[PDB]
């Protein structure tokens, strides 16, 4: 069966994702402007993984 | 399509067009941040080396440009070139 | 349709991988991010950030597995072998298995996948001879498969109790077992008036 | 002596249980599958055996007739260990080889190749019909009635003439019922 | 001088500081295909950047014109250019027509800077002084050759550049003569590019067994032509092998057990992957010594094997299937009677990689297979473009082969090497019987017009292999003096002769008072001068200038000028 | 008789191999390898981010090596050659040979971010600057080891006649202060297997290693395999060595009560509350060139009676009382040293204040377990003494509650008086 869509969870998660992507873009702009990128790579992969999970769930339902 | 018309009945063709419209409607708006048409394979690899299967000339990127030159290899993040790979230009 | 058929009623090994990486793990950082009281910061969301900004060289700590693997791809991290991944532990589990043919051993729910990942990208860290570890894991796999067949012999509509079966094995056997149970239940119910 | 045979058997068991390339015990898995389809027989590449340890391959080449049965026994033991839970039967397994080395033309074959593992090719001209070969026998002693049996191999034996618990010159006889046999064809090559 | 050995790490750090940005890739690596050591160097650099996680691109190239057009299409975003094994002698700034002002940015202050950076690893020897000195956008990772040999050349160049009249003449003519003397000298590779990159990694402390193996492979490939360079570098590679060697000794062989050990690498062909008889039968040195090309040489080969006491039948058996007794006592067998036959030089200790139970491989055999893969991995202008596309595909195939996982590709390369080697041997014996070699008194011209193997010879490396075998036989032939060797191969589809100018060489084992001197190669300069003087269509575009093309009808007139040329 | 031999912290002999670790520490490890006469020195840094690995060949065959973030101090005892190699590489590897009289052999070498120190078999202490400019030469009791952390230099002065002695001093850029001078070092020398002797041949003193603590307290690990820390080292009056670990007992503990032998803790460096060291589970107490992953073990006050544990077992079980006592002592000493460092040297990390607060809490709660233990014994007087040591008055509320649950009205009254007194 289709499970009750946990509205609040996805709402908060999407808000966090939006702001996270925006601030990542801000760090990218700063780079264009220490400077170790390892945390930047961790951000990029974390966002990719989270977006992947959300997409999987959405497509499944 | 999110990323043989003769075989399709005209009703089938219209329905498929409507379905494509519906999908683009979904990925547009709320939830746009995630690309529903995106691959359902998990992004295990942050970075992937790729060889251009078919030369198509330079292509643009958010912060760069990729010169697609037959038998030229690129080491770039998977996400950026996943669409090109799906388009068959890029190998591995 | 939004979901390929092969994904309709199960998880492919890649999804199993991902869910495994969601876990944390002991590691020995080769970097000291911890800024002295005398700068780029991680600031993650889905996992802890406190530890990450407090990395100190050669100081054990926990991080989600996928971050650990990302660093291990670099020379900047070392993955600490889980205790259960030890010749002594594997031998003990093997002996338990032979001792209790009916029951499975209490391996980590993610033992197979975790072992494979570490073997592929963590050969250096493993203290014990890696070949012996691979062999013992293979033997455990064989024994568990045999016990799986023995249990299958008793497939019944009522219910099943896999107990300590590992997640990877569960995903492997999901389709067959589920379908057989479904057909058996259909038959028995049809028998019911 | 028997100790050396046991040592060779152990070496072959180790080869099967240990020979790994990349991250797969190719031979362990192959044996497990072949058992899974009841095909109680294993195929081995000579190059792989050499890679594991040249010594076993060379010993095999020296005395194939005796080495091979030991290898098949090792295969049987490994099959029992991997397919049947210990402290919780299978037939003798057929061993299949693939040298893939330089061939020897049919005509060239001569005394030099006697008892040597040969590698060649041709076209099969005819095929016989399968016959019985007694892997195992059930044996009764004609006068004292002493039970016994023999396990014979298709390499390189006859019904013992002695009583082993005068009773007779050949008091032993075959009990076809309890005995076990296999198939054996005969092919001709040009 | 421009970038000396000591400052390789600093140049690398500068490259990072410029092109390091996860946002986009600003580093492009131009690599001239058809060079084993170049491929190894490029792979090493690729792995290094992978560690540094700096996005970059690989650009295989075959000809100078290809490099020119590729630079034309370049994007300003790219600021780092890595040129591997090409451009060292040419005036890249002139050839690429780079204007410093076009790229000049942030010059300031006694300082200079440009938007792009052209790094050159082309270690031939006759460094373009303008590149060394005149250019700044040009960056050359020099092995110190400039600071050790060209100091007078540097002085003369800076004086001539300073000059901007009896005294004027009395100085300018001497400086011009000095520069010309530094010119007009044939090309001769100085050192392994792989060796330079390995040294740089040592500076960056990235050295690992894999990198050492790659450097070993590059140097071993270089050996055949510039044996002296290989001899000079061998102690260093052995030192590194010992340095990275694990403590455990005689550890039980396991699939995971991987070793790179030095032990006798007999100077033969595919010994481990071909019958001893075959290995001897195709070992260039062996044939040169015994003249196996003639049937009497084959008779002597049978005699030698009989002397070994080895059953010939056994000698033709697969090496992996040798009897253990022979497979192990071959050391003593070679120790005996090798001098009797004068083949004692074959004995050579060398690097031999191995892994798990899959088997073993000598660096020599590995590089041989790599060359075979490079060569046979698979409107006239379109035909040439397609041929060079096949060559580039072979380049990438070899790149893939470098990975250990793709052992299947390595085996395929081994079989291809066997086939090519036997074909080369057959062609060489046919040539010698035909006496196609003509003593022109300026060179031993040998033009090729026979159909079979001609298609294969269209590949420059295949022609180089055939010519190398011929040169081995000739040099071993004491009657023949070190005359320059000329090879041409007509391509029916293009109706052009693949002219190749092959330098002579003193006997492999030869190491007396002479042989020490390097016989530079003036083939390229002679070809270029004749081409400029004449108009016969030719192709100097190929990075190896010694190899050029010419019309089937432009050949003989060009040959006539060549013998007429005094440059040779 | 005793033999004076060159030593470096946690060094390892060549043994049967041609490669040995010149020395190892938190910063990294340097291992050399014989190579056709010429020795190949490889300098490995633990923190890849901080520094970069580099390897150079040593013709002099330097056997003495000192590692510190600033640089390395390679020296050869028999020759007197000493070479410094700044890690920054901004400055050349200044090198010089010291005057070695007949038999004068460099015992060890100490590196200070500003000064340089060299010790000799004859006890000829020598001081050079970062650039090698000499400072002065001094004769002292022969120094076998020359640990030097930051500006704190700890030396082990031993003699056949003066016996075991140590001098603690922090030279610093200025105001050179000698905390202690050749005071007797309370450590037990090895008893006089082949590998053990060879290490003793390679380390006559038998010092497994020598280093300062994470915060910078001197740390020693002798052949006894006991890690001794100089409690109150900053104050000589109360300075005292406390055994914070007895590796043998801990190994026998984690072994499930098994008397393992091959296990050999190779002291590398002492993190706060935890020892970074390699467990060499082989005949050679020293590790091998393929250095394994360092192991971490928490410090333990050695107050476990092995007989008690054996009786419990007959996975080792520890009585909650003896355990609680051990944690009490460990927390007490840790808090002592933590407060001393915090007040004397501030904190390199702000967390230390909260760490000390939690440690005081654990101290009080250990007093509380033992208070309950005494109450169960009806030793209301002993329990009263325990509550007396209690640091937190809220923990004292917990204690009076325990006494109520222990049915000790006299006890409860006593702890109530204690409440009032602390309120006073
Ligand atoms: Zn009888």
UniProtKB/Swiss-Prot annotation, chain A:
Keywords: DNA replication, Nucleus. It comes from the Eukaryota. It is found in: Nucleus. Its main location: nucleus. GO terms for cellular component: CMG complex; DNA replication preinitiation complex; GINS complex; nuclear replication fork; nucleus. One of its GO terms (biological process) is DNA-templated DNA replication. Component of the GINS complex which is a heterotetramer composed of SLD5, PSF1, PSF2 and PSF3. Interacts with PSF2. Belongs to the GINS4/SLD5 family. Required for DNA replication. Functions as part of the GINS complex which plays an essential role in the initiation of DNA replication by binding to DNA replication origins and facilitating the assembly of the DNA replication machinery. This is DNA replication complex GINS protein SLD5.
From Swiss-Prot, chain B:
Signal peptide: none annotated. The keyword ATP-binding does not apply. It comes from Saccharomyces cerevisiae (strain ATCC 204508 / S288c) (Baker's yeast). The chain holds residues 105 to 207 of 208 of the full protein. Keywords: Cell cycle, DNA replication, Nucleus. Component of the GINS complex which is a heterotetramer of SLD5, PSF1, PSF2 and PSF3. Interacts with PSF2. This is DNA replication complex GINS protein PSF1. Present with 1431 molecules/cell in log phase SD medium. GO terms for biological process: DNA strand elongation involved in mitotic DNA replication; DNA-templated DNA replication; double-strand break repair via break-induced replication. One of its GO terms (cellular component) is CMG complex. The keyword Nucleus applies. It is found in: Nucleus. Belongs to the GINS1/PSF1 family. It comes from the Eukaryota. Required for DNA replication. Functions as part of the GINS complex which plays an essential role in the initiation of DNA replication by binding to DNA replication origins and facilitating the assembly of the DNA replication machinery. Required for the chromatin binding of CDC45.
From Swiss-Prot, chain C:
GO terms for cellular component: CMG complex; DNA replication preinitiation complex; GINS complex; nuclear replication fork; nucleus. Its main location: nucleus. SUPFAM superfamilies: GINS helical bundle-like, PriA/YqbF domain. It is found in: Nucleus. Pfam families: PSF2_N, Sld5. One of its GO terms (biological process) is DNA-templated DNA replication. Keywords: DNA replication, Nucleus. Belongs to the GINS2/PSF2 family. Component of the GINS complex which is a heterotetramer of SLD5, PSF1, PSF2 and PSF3. Interacts with PSF1 and SLD5. Functions as part of the GINS complex which plays an essential role in the initiation of DNA replication by binding to DNA replication origins and facilitating the assembly of the DNA replication machinery. This is DNA replication complex GINS protein PSF2. It comes from Saccharomyces cerevisiae (strain ATCC 204508 / S288c) (Baker's yeast). The gene is PSF2.
UniProtKB/Swiss-Prot annotation, chain F:
It comes from the Eukaryota. It is found in: Nucleus. WD repeats lie at residues 222-262. Accessory factor for DNA replication. It plays a role in accurately duplicating the genome in vivo. Present with 3280 molecules/cell in log phase SD medium. This is DNA polymerase alpha-binding protein.
